[PDB]
Design an enzyme around this catalytic site. Sequence first.
Site, PDB file in Angstrom:
ATOM      1  N   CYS A 105      69.488   4.855  31.431  1.00 27.58           N
ATOM      2  CA  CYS A 105      70.785   5.521  31.366  1.00 27.58           C
ATOM      3  C   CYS A 105      70.599   6.956  30.879  1.00 27.58           C
ATOM      4  CB  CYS A 105      71.761   4.752  30.467  1.00 27.58           C
ATOM      5  SG  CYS A 105      73.409   5.492  30.395  1.00 27.58           S
ATOM      6  N   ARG A 108      73.404   8.498  27.701  1.00 27.48           N
ATOM      7  CA  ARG A 108      73.459   7.863  26.395  1.00 27.48           C
ATOM      8  C   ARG A 108      73.907   8.796  25.268  1.00 27.48           C
ATOM      9  NH1 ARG A 108      67.686   5.116  26.137  1.00 27.48           N
ATOM     10  NH2 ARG A 108      67.213   6.760  27.677  1.00 27.48           N
ATOM     11  N   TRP A 277      81.697   6.881  33.273  1.00 23.66           N
ATOM     12  CA  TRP A 277      82.121   7.695  34.394  1.00 23.66           C
ATOM     13  C   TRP A 277      80.873   8.092  35.161  1.00 23.66           C
ATOM     14  CZ3 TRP A 277      83.450   8.998  29.379  1.00 23.66           C
ATOM     15  CH2 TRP A 277      82.587   9.891  28.744  1.00 23.66           C
ATOM     16  N   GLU A 282      74.938  10.337  41.650  1.00 28.68           N
ATOM     17  CA  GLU A 282      75.034   8.931  42.017  1.00 28.68           C
ATOM     18  C   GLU A 282      75.801   8.773  43.324  1.00 28.68           C
ATOM     19  OE1 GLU A 282      75.326   5.935  38.631  1.00 28.68           O
ATOM     20  OE2 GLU A 282      76.394   7.660  37.783  1.00 28.68           O
TER      21      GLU A 282
HETATM   22  C1  HEM Z   1      79.681   7.625  29.929  1.00 25.40           C
HETATM   23  C2  HEM Z   1      78.992   8.179  30.941  1.00 25.40           C
HETATM   24  C3  HEM Z   1      77.772   7.516  31.655  1.00 25.40           C
HETATM   25  C4  HEM Z   1      77.026   8.112  32.594  1.00 25.40           C
HETATM   26  C5  HEM Z   1      77.215   9.541  33.144  1.00 25.40           C
HETATM   27  C6  HEM Z   1      75.999   7.199  33.035  1.00 25.40           C
HETATM   28  C7  HEM Z   1      75.027   7.452  33.986  1.00 25.40           C
HETATM   29  C8  HEM Z   1      74.043   6.574  34.388  1.00 25.40           C
HETATM   30  C9  HEM Z   1      73.154   6.755  35.513  1.00 25.40           C
HETATM   31  C10 HEM Z   1      73.149   7.976  36.440  1.00 25.40           C
HETATM   32  C11 HEM Z   1      72.347   5.699  35.596  1.00 25.40           C
HETATM   33  C12 HEM Z   1      71.252   5.490  36.662  1.00 25.40           C
HETATM   34  C13 HEM Z   1      71.563   4.211  37.437  1.00 25.40           C
HETATM   35  C14 HEM Z   1      71.422   4.429  38.918  1.00 25.40           C
HETATM   36  O1  HEM Z   1      71.304   5.600  39.349  1.00 25.40           O
HETATM   37  O2  HEM Z   1      71.433   3.422  39.666  1.00 25.40           O
HETATM   38  C15 HEM Z   1      72.705   4.794  34.522  1.00 25.40           C
HETATM   39  C16 HEM Z   1      72.112   3.582  34.238  1.00 25.40           C
HETATM   40  C17 HEM Z   1      72.508   2.674  33.292  1.00 25.40           C
HETATM   41  N1  HEM Z   1      73.583   2.821  32.446  1.00 25.40           N
HETATM   42 FE1  HEM Z   1      74.626   4.556  32.081  1.00 25.40          FE
HETATM   43  N2  HEM Z   1      76.148   6.029  32.325  1.00 25.40           N
HETATM   44  C18 HEM Z   1      77.233   6.175  31.469  1.00 25.40           C
HETATM   45  C19 HEM Z   1      77.687   5.200  30.597  1.00 25.40           C
HETATM   46  C20 HEM Z   1      77.119   3.958  30.359  1.00 25.40           C
HETATM   47  C21 HEM Z   1      77.666   2.879  29.543  1.00 25.40           C
HETATM   48  C22 HEM Z   1      79.011   2.937  28.801  1.00 25.40           C
HETATM   49  C23 HEM Z   1      76.815   1.843  29.587  1.00 25.40           C
HETATM   50  C24 HEM Z   1      76.903   0.468  28.881  1.00 25.40           C
HETATM   51  C25 HEM Z   1      77.600   0.261  27.766  1.00 25.40           C
HETATM   52  C26 HEM Z   1      75.689   2.232  30.408  1.00 25.40           C
HETATM   53  C27 HEM Z   1      74.589   1.452  30.687  1.00 25.40           C
HETATM   54  C28 HEM Z   1      73.647   1.693  31.666  1.00 25.40           C
HETATM   55  C29 HEM Z   1      72.558   0.819  32.037  1.00 25.40           C
HETATM   56  C30 HEM Z   1      72.245  -0.551  31.405  1.00 25.40           C
HETATM   57  C31 HEM Z   1      71.869   1.409  33.004  1.00 25.40           C
HETATM   58  C32 HEM Z   1      70.629   0.826  33.719  1.00 25.40           C
HETATM   59  C33 HEM Z   1      71.179  -0.071  34.828  1.00 25.40           C
HETATM   60  C34 HEM Z   1      70.173  -0.335  35.919  1.00 25.40           C
HETATM   61  O3  HEM Z   1      68.956  -0.282  35.619  1.00 25.40           O
HETATM   62  O4  HEM Z   1      70.590  -0.610  37.077  1.00 25.40           O
HETATM   63  N3  HEM Z   1      75.911   3.517  30.863  1.00 25.40           N
HETATM   64  N4  HEM Z   1      73.734   5.368  33.805  1.00 25.40           N
HETATM   65  C1  LIG Z   2      74.174   4.793  42.366  1.00 25.98           C
HETATM   66  N1  LIG Z   2      74.129   4.256  40.992  1.00 25.98           N
HETATM   67  C2  LIG Z   2      74.325   2.789  40.952  1.00 25.98           C
HETATM   68  C3  LIG Z   2      74.362   2.364  39.495  1.00 25.98           C
HETATM   69  C4  LIG Z   2      73.540   1.337  39.043  1.00 25.98           C
HETATM   70  C5  LIG Z   2      73.560   0.959  37.706  1.00 25.98           C
HETATM   71  C6  LIG Z   2      74.399   1.602  36.809  1.00 25.98           C
HETATM   72  C7  LIG Z   2      75.237   2.620  37.250  1.00 25.98           C
HETATM   73  C8  LIG Z   2      76.149   3.309  36.293  1.00 25.98           C
HETATM   74  C9  LIG Z   2      76.714   2.633  35.219  1.00 25.98           C
HETATM   75  C10 LIG Z   2      77.560   3.317  34.360  1.00 25.98           C
HETATM   76  C11 LIG Z   2      78.184   2.618  33.184  1.00 25.98           C
HETATM   77  C12 LIG Z   2      77.823   4.658  34.572  1.00 25.98           C
HETATM   78  C13 LIG Z   2      77.243   5.295  35.660  1.00 25.98           C
HETATM   79  N2  LIG Z   2      77.496   6.608  35.908  1.00 25.98           N
HETATM   80  N3  LIG Z   2      76.432   4.606  36.485  1.00 25.98           N
HETATM   81  C14 LIG Z   2      75.216   2.998  38.594  1.00 25.98           C
HETATM   82 CL   LIG Z   3      77.408   3.652  42.383  1.00 25.72          CL
END
Ligand code: HEM
Ligand SMILES: CNCc1cccc(-c2cc(C)cc(N)n2)c1
Ligand SMILES: [Cl-]
EC number: 1.14.13.39
Lengths: 401, 401
Positions: A105, A108, A277, A282
């Site tokens: 993530c 964070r 958000w 993405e």
């Molecule tokens: C608040 C703004 C947030 C942004 C901009 C954001 C952005 C992202 C992005 C770009 C990824 C990459 C995943 C992908 O590209 O497939 C990601 C992964 C992830 N996010 Fe965040 N996120 C946010 C909030 C959160 C919250 C609130 C949680 C949980 C409480 C969270 C948990 C995770 C987890 C567990 C992953 C890894 C998931 C995976 O491996 O598929 N995120 N996030």
């Molecule tokens: C193309 N991304 C797929 C994907 C895969 C896993 C996680 C996300 C995710 C989750 C959250 C809480 C925020 C954000 N911005 N993204 C998105």
């Molecule tokens: Cl998505």
Amino acid sequence: KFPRVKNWEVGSITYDTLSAQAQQDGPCTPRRCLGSLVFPPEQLLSQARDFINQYYSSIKRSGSQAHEQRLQEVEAEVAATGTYQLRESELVFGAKQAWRNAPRCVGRIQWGKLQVFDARDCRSAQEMFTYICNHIKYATNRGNLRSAITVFPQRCPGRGDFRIWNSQLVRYAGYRQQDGSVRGDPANVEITELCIQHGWTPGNGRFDVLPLLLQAPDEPPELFLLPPELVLEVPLEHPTLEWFAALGLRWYALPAVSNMLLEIGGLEFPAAPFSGWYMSTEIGTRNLCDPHRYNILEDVAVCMDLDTRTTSSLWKDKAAVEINVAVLHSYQLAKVTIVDHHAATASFMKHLENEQKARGGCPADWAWIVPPISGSLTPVFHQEMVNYFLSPAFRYQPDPW
Amino acid sequence: FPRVKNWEVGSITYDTLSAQAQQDGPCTPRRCLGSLVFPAPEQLLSQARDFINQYYSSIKRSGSQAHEQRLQEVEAEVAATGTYQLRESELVFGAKQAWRNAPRCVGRIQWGKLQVFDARDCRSAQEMFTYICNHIKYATNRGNLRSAITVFPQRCPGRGDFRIWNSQLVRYAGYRQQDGSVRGDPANVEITELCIQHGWTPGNGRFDVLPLLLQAPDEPPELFLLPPELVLEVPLEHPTLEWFAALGLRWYALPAVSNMLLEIGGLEFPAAPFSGWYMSTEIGTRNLCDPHRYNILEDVAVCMDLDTRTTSSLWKDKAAVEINVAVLHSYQLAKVTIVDHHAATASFMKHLENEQKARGGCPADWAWIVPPISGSLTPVFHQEMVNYFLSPAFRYQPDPW
Ligand code: HEM
Ligand SMILES: CNCc1cccc(-c2cc(C)cc(N)n2)c1
Ligand SMILES: [Cl-]
Ligand code: HEM
Ligand SMILES: CNCc1cccc(-c2cc(C)cc(N)n2)c1
Ligand SMILES: C[C@H](O)[C@H](O)[C@H]1CNc2nc(N)[nH]c(=O)c2N1
Ligand SMILES: C[C@H](O)[C@H](O)[C@H]1CNc2nc(N)[nH]c(=O)c2N1
Ligand SMILES: [Cl-]
Ligand SMILES: [Gd]
Ligand SMILES: [Gd]
Ligand SMILES: [Zn+2]
């Protein structure tokens, strides 16, 4: 034994002492590195003990009062029941800590700002649905998006699981044809096939919001039509390419991951949908431009009259920047919270520095933190990162079928 | 056997070749250090034993006549001399192999088309300089670049190493300024200073080509100016942005890495400069836009009339893409071989396939294979990779000062 971590833009050096805590073994060995791969009774007490000692140290309450107390009542709770329930505040502290620890993530910096809905007293799919709908409408908040996680009941033997069968709460349909190829989103073809296989009337278009498949313990799952007024979507237009609107592209406002298994203190909640958000890449890069996704890159480039005949025109690169510009423009015009990959990575650098001060490090999956466009233009590219597993965490989990 | 998925297609292979990974990398099951930039006669015998095995596999004569003799020869020689000498064909095969095995080279589709200049009879810094000029001359080939390497005498007991102090045969001076800044390439401040210290008369331009510092064994390094007409450069212009030529930017034609150690069958060649041709992103993104390099991105965006006051306008992405366009166009205009990141990554995908049928896998450093702009626009983004160390190999080595 303390990893030296350099930043190649500034020259600064730090050491990741926090890496010393890594619980669940990673995929990498001295002989091969697998970091680029996506998906690589009373044991419960060790993880239970550790998580409680975390909580209390985090509230500056190590070795005093409720510390030893709460230790006993979980020693007793597991003794009697073979499991334990989390104190409300701990389930909150564990949800925030899992996010804090998600190496992939990049958002964070926001980890301390999270709304935990407690659905631990949930029973039946109809129950989750309103919990999900509460979350969704809370998280969406008319576009001023707010991070939230709804934690459904933990897991026990001899009972089924709480599972959201979709990967996200908002996913787009994907339909085959008299030629296999897909209209809609090919990343959801399978769950789209399930939703119809469970009796959903399939639409025509390339942006039909899928119905949820919610599953209650020891029960085959039920279809749920999300309220259309509850699915905030952003029609995609481009600030200056008047025809982009005509391409008919949309994406949804709320990124809500509904297939990962929250794990706190050795308790495993297979249904704990979290949401934040989006970061614009993405949507604009992965979702629209991946060849196995909406794969709109060439379409946009034709409309821009780019030279698609030669790779060295960088028409792919040019059309992809504009698709991202449309995403950021459209979400901002709709006043939907969204963060560009520059703002986002820069905040993550700020986060790494906070975490270096707070916990002496930060588990970070380089390949997922570096955005999918303009990598070395963002500072995280030039930042070395250490990847490890800390608890509590979000984990992947098998598809519930 | 690590399973490897391609996410663009669904392809899945298992990297059986990783199992032969001899030397160990930096990752453990605790922590991944993938993203880190910088991770006895009997052992010389097993390395040599293995490489000779390798070499005899390649000539389709495994376990044959010549094979046994060479083993016993090398052992008798190691017993007698403490070391051994590569035959010339073994040397050509060990230099091609070391390029084949280089995990961070996207250009490895070309690994068999490699011109090996045997300079192991080199005697002085002066002869070293002549060999190097002929390398540069052969490789540059007036812009039709040819992949080449010159193998200088191997490390051996009793004599110091041959060394090229310069990280590359062609580098741009980096003069620390009056007001604390850098003129030229900040990556080359150290080597510039060493040149000056060793009696180089510095210039004061931004693209002053550096002299060579050449160390003959047990000798101080010696300074050798490269003839200006040996160093083919490319003035940078943009096919549409005509003000772009007024930036005065140039890059050189020949990427010749000169500070890496070449290892073949336990033997160590501390001086073996190798050269291919550029991939435009190295120049366009990294060399010119890295904040710690020429750092032109803001000046281009300002000149481009982009709104540099908000990151959501993607002025960084837009300006970087035209810098890469300019690099590609400037090099085609000047008839100097150049490969764009789309073509390069697509031939690397063929390399991985050829390597899978050939060796059951291929060592690959995703973070180095994936281009620093437009990552997911290229196919290598959606390819999982297994990074590990095979021998023969190009290794890093400490700087000789
Ligand atoms: C608040 C703004 C947030 C942004 C901009 C954001 C952005 C992202 C992005 C770009 C990824 C990459 C995943 C992908 O590209 O497939 C990601 C992964 C992830 N996010 Fe965040 N996120 C946010 C909030 C959160 C919250 C609130 C949680 C949980 C409480 C969270 C948990 C995770 C987890 C567990 C992953 C890894 C998931 C995976 O491996 O598929 N995120 N996030
Ligand atoms: C193309 N991304 C797929 C994907 C895969 C896993 C996680 C996300 C995710 C989750 C959250 C809480 C925020 C954000 N911005 N993204 C998105
Ligand atoms: Cl998505
Ligand atoms: C012929 C066309 C070639 C292309 C297009 C190419 C491309 C590249 C690129 C883009 C990198 C990454 C460097 C960076 O991003 O800073 C790289 C690294 C590397 N290449 Fe190639 N290369 C070519 C030829 C060669 C040859 C001929 C050799 C050896 C005989 C070689 C050996 C290596 C090595 C050892 C590295 C790693 C160096 C390091 O880790 O800093 N390459 N190559
Ligand atoms: C930003 N590049 C620095 C760098 C660092 C290391 C290697 C290269 C290299 C080497 C060769 C033989 C071809 C090529 N295309 N690149 C370049
Ligand atoms: C093969 C490769 O590991 C895979 O495509 C990863 C790389 N980095 C990523 N990074 C993010 N943020 N999201 C992803 O899906 C991926 N995919
Ligand atoms: C810190 C980070 O590992 C570093 O900037 C790496 C990332 N990937 C790279 N990839 C390539 N090809 N070349 C590089 O110099 C780097 N730098
Ligand atoms: Cl370079
Ligand atoms: Gd038109
Ligand atoms: Gd123009
Ligand atoms: Zn690793």
